[PDB]
Ligand binder design. Structure first.
Ligand SMILES: CC(C)(COP(=O)(O)OP(=O)(O)OC[C@H]1O[C@@H](n2cnc3c(N)ncnc32)[C@H](O)[C@@H]1OP(=O)(O)O)[C@@H](O)C(=O)NCCC(=O)NCCSC(=O)c1ccccc1
Ligand code: SF4
Lengths: 438, 375
């Protein structure tokens, strides 16, 4: 509604095509003798990348979210996992993934492809259980990186030793499981590309601080997802650079994702698919979601910049730090991943509370809508302490209950009524503030 | 009847009175501990009384602003005890890393219990199966020792650490000796009595508790058994600290002869190995302990530990007691059930809130008993 110019993202189609190609490459991995492996989006995927350019992952949570988009298939998958005997209140992505494996159906067509091995990161308790069941049903080798060494800000040499030494076990593991010789050059390239892509995703997010926001979070769900597919690939790092050029051009031209932008919102954890239509309704109020700690830092890697603001973490070779050998690459790679903002609340919720208050400030947020996500213990721990900290700060904040993967636990009607009440609340607050300051 | 375990029952019922009086008697600090991986030897060596936070199993409405209701009854019940002031005599609070839900109890407690003077989170490795976990946990335990020495201003010497480990290992060995009596055809120790002993070990001065275990074991050889054993049950779960519920189980015509739970075997099972570096002895004792589900990967070593216990204690039926929403145990449950049932041990599944009416559970246990009596 005529306040700002708008324009559809031109790289939209390429983001969609890269994602489709990732899933098709996993399914077709064996046509030319490639390697397939599975694990979390938080797996340290440069380690399997040392085994070649034809090493294809299937990351478990983005795949499960793709099934969740197909409500009917997701229900069938969860029904199969429940039949096996798992509790329905376990992680909804894990239950979807298990059920699709038992049904032997891939969301993109064909049988569920067998992985050659599991390579996993363990920080949520369900991270082990998810792939213990998978490795047993598929009869494949399995490796787990324990990254539970506490907050990055408290890191010690010994803590970093524990993760780095495990990664060296991981190298030996993937060699054994694949039959291939690990190549230091491919590995170092994959580390550098992961550093590029995760830092560049953060840089892109940081462009959203301006008014009008060049991106809306619904659009960003198709863009942040690439790093959850293969953050260590060349294609992902190169696309993030391309994408950054386009978003920079949007900022230069005063382009808004939402042309009647008047209200800036921040969300938190991954929403159910049914919420996306609420974002569209919110636009009739001129409300845009600028992002969340989840969209910004599930894979984005950040640092404090010279002006105190939050931006993409500096690449080590831009800081004079060389990466010329395996041991140096392993330690730097462990350190890079340990700084992930979305791992800190597993130890101390106040770290996430401070992170949310900083996003509210730097991205000029007017109101916060928190998903109390019954579908994900790992990203929901501490959520009520986060709400309290935002409540005390004086920023408007509301909650709604849901489940990102199981819409049996999401009430569309009640949630839309709560979000509409919030828009009314934001209007009332604006009238009162204007009346006080005249 | 003979009242042999009455001191443990008093300690459990009057745990807070005990703590306050301990402070009067010793001048020492009390530390609220969370999860059975807390390295208690360090707290004892620092002159402190570790007391494990447990729930009250009563209705409570103080935790809703702090912990979302999708999380387990235990982490919420435990936090309520802090918020309600029932651990106001505790200067410290400490958690050793395990289940992520439990970490919320710790985080809300240190932020909102106004009598907390210090806190410490120990990031014990979860992957105890890794060849690097025992070195990493050595350094965590040494770092906690340095924290405690700095906090109290008193050097915590290797001798003080060895004397504390000796008290803890003696407690572990005495609890194992007490458990040995449950293997008999007519156990001189019931499941409830064993639980009073093993639970109070977690919030009574270990020197005093060891003395009571020694008295108890001195009596057992000549203790008359009046009750009929009935079916030989095992209980399986995470904490399993509702002793009243266990008493209902044993009143239906059964005895709980062994358990896999942190109120019991999983807390004390192994004593440390003889070892000259006391920090290594302590850190490795915990890495070597039967694992929490959270710490049990890539291998499910828990499955062999649980079946081995079941066979060694001649178990006839195994009862899974599950906290609502408990992800680590929910993740193991389907295949651990199968493992037991494939090895000849029928199982029963019961699920718990903070409180539950006991009648529906009794009916289910009576029906289970019937299944055992056929085939
Ligand atoms: C492909 C989906 C699944 C669907 O998305 P959609 O885009 O909504 O649906 P469509 O594909 O049908 O596209 C049609 C839409 O395109 C719009 N449009 C048209 N032109 C343009 C344009 N030029 N520019 C921009 N947009 C344009 C057009 O408006 C239309 O939408 P509308 O009807 O108007 O509203 C995508 O959202 C996605 O990948 N999400 C990520 C999910 C995932 O896998 N997540 C990772 C989970 S990892 C995790 O949780 C985790 C990891 C570790 C630890 C713990 C947790
Ligand atoms: S509960 Fe959340 S963090 Fe844990 S496995 Fe599931 S999606 Fe990941």
């Amino acid at each position: 509604a005529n306040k700002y110019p708008t324009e559809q993202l031109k790289l939209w189609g390429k983001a969609k095509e890269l994602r489709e190609q990732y899933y098709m490459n996993y399914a077709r991995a064996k046509e030319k003798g490639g390697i397939r492996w599975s694990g979390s989006a938080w797996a340290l995927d440069a380690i399997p990348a040392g085994l070649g350019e034809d090493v294809y992952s299937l990351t478990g949570e983005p795949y499960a979210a793709a099934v969740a988009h197909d409500r009917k298939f997701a229900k069938e998958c969860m029904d199969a996992a429940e039949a096996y005997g798992f509790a329905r209140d376990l992680c909804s992505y894990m239950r979807i993934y298990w059920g699709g494996m038992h049904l032997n159906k891939y969301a993109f067509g064909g049988e569920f492809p067998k992985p050659d091995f599991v390579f996993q990161t363990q920080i949520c308790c369900s991270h082990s259980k998810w792939y213990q069941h998978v490795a047993k049903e598929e009869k494949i080798p399995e490796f787990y990186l324990d990254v539970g060494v506490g907050p990055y800000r408290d890191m010690t040499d010994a803590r970093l030793d524990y993760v780095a030494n495990q990664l060296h076990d991981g190298i030996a593991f993937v060699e054994k499981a694949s039959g291939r010789k690990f190549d230091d050059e491919l590995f170092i390239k994959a580390v550098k590309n992961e550093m590029r892509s995760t830092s560049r995703w953060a840089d892109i997010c940081a462009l959203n601080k301006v008014k009008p926001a060049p991106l809306d979070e619904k659009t960003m769900y198709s863009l942040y997802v690439l790093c959850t597919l293969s953050k260590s690939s060349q294609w992902c790092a190169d696309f993030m650079d391309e994408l950054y050029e386009e978003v920079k051009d949007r900022v230069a031209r005063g382009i808004a994702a939402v042309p009647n932008e008047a209200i800036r919102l921040m969300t938190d954890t991954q929403p159910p698919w049914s919420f996306l239509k609420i974002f569209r309704y919110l636009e009739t109020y001129g409300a845009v979601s600028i992002g969340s700690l989840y969209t910004f830092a599930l894979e984005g890697i950040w640092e404090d910049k010279p002006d105190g603001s939050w931006g993409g973490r500096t690449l080590p070779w831009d800081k004079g730090i060389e990466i010329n050998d395996r041991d140096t690459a392993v330690r730097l790679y462990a350190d890079w991943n340990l700084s992930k903002p979305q791992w800190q609340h597993f130890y101390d919720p106040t770290i996430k509370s401070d992170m949310m208050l900083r996003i509210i400030k730097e991205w000029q947020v007017d109101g916060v809508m928190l998903h109390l996500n019954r579908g994900c213990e790992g990203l929901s721990v501490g959520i009520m302490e986060n709400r309290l900290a935002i409540a005390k700060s004086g920023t408007p904040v509301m909650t709604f209950e849901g489940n990102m993967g199981d819409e049996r636990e999401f009430d569309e009607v009640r949630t839309q009524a709560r979000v509409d009440a919030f828009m009314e609340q934001l209007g009332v607050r604006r009238q009162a503030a204007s009346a006080w300051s005249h | 009847s003979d009242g042999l375990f009455d001191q443990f029952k008093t300690w459990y019922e009057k745990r807070h009175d005990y703590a306050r009086d301990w402070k009067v008697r010793t001048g020492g600090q009390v530390v609220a501990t969370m999860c059975t991986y807390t390295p208690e030897e360090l707290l004892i060596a620092a002159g402190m009384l570790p007391v494990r936070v447990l729930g009250a199993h009563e209705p409570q409405n103080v935790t809703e602003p702090h912990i979302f209701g999708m999380f387990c009854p235990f982490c919420r019940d435990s936090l309520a005890q802090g918020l309600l002031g029932r651990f106001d005599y505790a200067e410290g609070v400490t958690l050793t890393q395990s289940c992520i839900q439990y970490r919320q109890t710790f985080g809300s407690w240190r932020l909102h219990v106004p009598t907390v003077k210090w806190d410490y989170y120990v990031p014990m490795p979860n992957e105890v199966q890794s060849p690097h976990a025992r070195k990493a946990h050595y350094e965590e335990v040494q770092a906690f020792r340095v924290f405690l020495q700095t906090l109290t201003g008193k050097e915590i010497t290797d001798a003080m650490l060895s004397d504390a480990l000796a008290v803890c290992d003696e407690n572990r060995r005495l609890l194992r000796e007490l458990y040995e009596y449950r293997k008999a055809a007519d156990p001189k120790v019931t499941g409830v009595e064993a639980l009073y002993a093993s639970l109070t070990a977690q919030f009574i001065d270990k020197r005093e508790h060891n003395e009571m275990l020694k008295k108890t074991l001195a009596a057992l050889p000549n203790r008359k058994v009046e009750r009929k054993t009935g079916a030989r049950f095992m209980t399986i779960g995470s904490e399993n600290d509702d002793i009243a519920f266990m008493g209902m189980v044993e009143s239906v015509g059964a005895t709980i002869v062994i358990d896999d739970q942190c109120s019991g075997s999983r807390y004390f099972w192994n004593a440390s190995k003889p070892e000259g570096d006391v920090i290594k002895a302590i850190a490795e004792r915990y890495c070597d302990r039967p694992a929490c589900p959270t710490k049990d990967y890539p291998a499910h070593t828990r499955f062999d530990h649980v079946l081995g216990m079941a066979k060694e204690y001649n178990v006839e039926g195994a009862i899974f007691l599950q906290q609502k929403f408990c992800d680590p145990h929910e993740g193991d449950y389907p295949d651990l059930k199968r493992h037991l049932e494939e090895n000849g041990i029928p199982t029963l599944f019961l699920e718990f809130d903070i409180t539950n009416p006991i009648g529906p559970f009794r009916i289910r246990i009576e029906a289970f008993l019937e299944t055992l009596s056929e085939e």
